[PDB]
Coordinates of C-alpha atoms and ligand atoms in Angstrom, one line a residue:
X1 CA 15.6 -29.1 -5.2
X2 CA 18.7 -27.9 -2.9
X3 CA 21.8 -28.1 -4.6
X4 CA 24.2 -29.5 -2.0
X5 CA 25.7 -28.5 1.8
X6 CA 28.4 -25.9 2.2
X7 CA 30.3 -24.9 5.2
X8 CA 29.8 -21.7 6.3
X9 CA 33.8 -21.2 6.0
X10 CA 32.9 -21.6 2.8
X11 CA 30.5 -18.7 2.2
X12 CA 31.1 -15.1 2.6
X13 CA 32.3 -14.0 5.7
X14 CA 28.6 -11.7 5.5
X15 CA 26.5 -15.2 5.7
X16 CA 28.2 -15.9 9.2
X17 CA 27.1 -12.4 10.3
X18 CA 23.5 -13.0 9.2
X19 CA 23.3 -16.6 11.0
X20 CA 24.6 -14.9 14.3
X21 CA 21.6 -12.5 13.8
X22 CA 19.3 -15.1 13.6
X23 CA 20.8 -16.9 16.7
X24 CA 20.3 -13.7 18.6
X25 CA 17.0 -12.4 17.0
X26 CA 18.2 -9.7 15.6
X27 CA 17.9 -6.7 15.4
X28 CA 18.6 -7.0 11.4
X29 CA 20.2 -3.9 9.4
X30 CA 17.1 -4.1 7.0
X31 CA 13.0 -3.7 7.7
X32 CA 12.7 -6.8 5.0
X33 CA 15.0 -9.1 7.0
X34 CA 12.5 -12.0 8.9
X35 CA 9.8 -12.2 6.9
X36 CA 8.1 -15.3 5.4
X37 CA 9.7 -16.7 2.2
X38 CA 6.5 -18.6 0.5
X39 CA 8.8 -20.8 -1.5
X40 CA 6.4 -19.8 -4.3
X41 CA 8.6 -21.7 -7.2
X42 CA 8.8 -24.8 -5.4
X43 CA 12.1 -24.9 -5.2
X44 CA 12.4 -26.1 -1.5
X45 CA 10.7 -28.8 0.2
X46 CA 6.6 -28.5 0.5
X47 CA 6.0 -27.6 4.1
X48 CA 2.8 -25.0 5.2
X49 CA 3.0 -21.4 5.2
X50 CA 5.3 -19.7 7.3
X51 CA 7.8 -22.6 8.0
X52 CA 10.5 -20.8 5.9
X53 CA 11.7 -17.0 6.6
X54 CA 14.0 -15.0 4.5
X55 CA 17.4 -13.0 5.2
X56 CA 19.5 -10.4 4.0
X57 CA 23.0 -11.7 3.3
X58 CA 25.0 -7.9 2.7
X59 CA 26.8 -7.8 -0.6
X60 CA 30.0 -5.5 0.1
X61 CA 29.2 -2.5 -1.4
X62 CA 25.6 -2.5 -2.7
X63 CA 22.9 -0.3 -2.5
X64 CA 20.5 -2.4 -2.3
X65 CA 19.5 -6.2 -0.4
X66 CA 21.5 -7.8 -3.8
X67 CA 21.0 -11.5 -4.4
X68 CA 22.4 -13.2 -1.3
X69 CA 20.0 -14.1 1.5
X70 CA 19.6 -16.9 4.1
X71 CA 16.1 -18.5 4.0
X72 CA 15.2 -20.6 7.6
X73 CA 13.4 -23.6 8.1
X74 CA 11.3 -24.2 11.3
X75 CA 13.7 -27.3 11.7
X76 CA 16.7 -27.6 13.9
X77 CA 20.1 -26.0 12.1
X78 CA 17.8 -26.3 8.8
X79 CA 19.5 -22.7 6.9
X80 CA 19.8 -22.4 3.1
X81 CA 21.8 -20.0 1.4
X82 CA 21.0 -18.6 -1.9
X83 CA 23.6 -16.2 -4.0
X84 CA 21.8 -15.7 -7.0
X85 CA 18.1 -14.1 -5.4
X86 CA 16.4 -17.6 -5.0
X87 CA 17.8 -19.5 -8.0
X88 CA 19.1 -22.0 -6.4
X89 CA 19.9 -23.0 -2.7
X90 CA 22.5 -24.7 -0.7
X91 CA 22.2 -26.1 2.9
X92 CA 24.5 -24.5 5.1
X93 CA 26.7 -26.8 7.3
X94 CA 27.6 -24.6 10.6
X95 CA 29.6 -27.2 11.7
X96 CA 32.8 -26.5 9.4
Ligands
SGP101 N1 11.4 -15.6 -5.6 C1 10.7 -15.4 -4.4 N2 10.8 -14.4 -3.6 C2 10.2 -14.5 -2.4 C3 9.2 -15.5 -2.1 N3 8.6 -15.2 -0.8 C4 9.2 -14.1 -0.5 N4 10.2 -13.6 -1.4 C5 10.9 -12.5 -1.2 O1 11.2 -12.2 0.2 C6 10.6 -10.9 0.4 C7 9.1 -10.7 0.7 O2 8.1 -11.2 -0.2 C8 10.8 -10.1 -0.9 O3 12.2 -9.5 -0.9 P1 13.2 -10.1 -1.9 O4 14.2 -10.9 -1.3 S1 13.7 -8.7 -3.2 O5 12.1 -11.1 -2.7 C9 10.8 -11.2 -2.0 C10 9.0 -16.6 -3.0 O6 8.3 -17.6 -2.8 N5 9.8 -16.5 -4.1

């Protein structure tokens, strides 16, 4: 299940960077960034292979990708946001 919608002035200033790599198709700081995201646990709706892709949100800091990421959906403005490595998801609402 998706735990709510945020607004992306509500998420690290680092998620808005990763959207507007998305908008513009890249290129993306790691080789990992843009691959598919298999929703595996279930956690997000059912849909067929490859419909969800998955993002690195940069933690400040880290060495490594950390736990934030942005996952798409094949669906118009359909973005979830994840800060604890696939946990649990939010939608993301770019409009505020
Ligand atoms: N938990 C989880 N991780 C996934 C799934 N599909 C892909 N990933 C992740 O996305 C990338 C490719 O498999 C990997 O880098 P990472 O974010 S560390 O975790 C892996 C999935 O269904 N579940």
């Amino acid at each position: 299940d998706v735990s709510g919608t945020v607004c992306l002035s509500a998420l690290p200033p680092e998620a808005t960077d990763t959207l507007n790599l998305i908008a513009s198709d890249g290129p993306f700081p790691y080789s990992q960034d843009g691959v598919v995201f298999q929703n595996r646990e279930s956690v997000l709706p059912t849909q067929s292979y490859g419909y969800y892709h998955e993002y690195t949100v940069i933690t400040p800091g880290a060495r490594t990708r950390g736990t934030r990421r942005i996952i798409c959906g094949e669906a118009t403005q359909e973005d979830y946001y994840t800060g604890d490595h696939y946990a649990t998801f939010s939608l993301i609402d770019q409009t505020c």
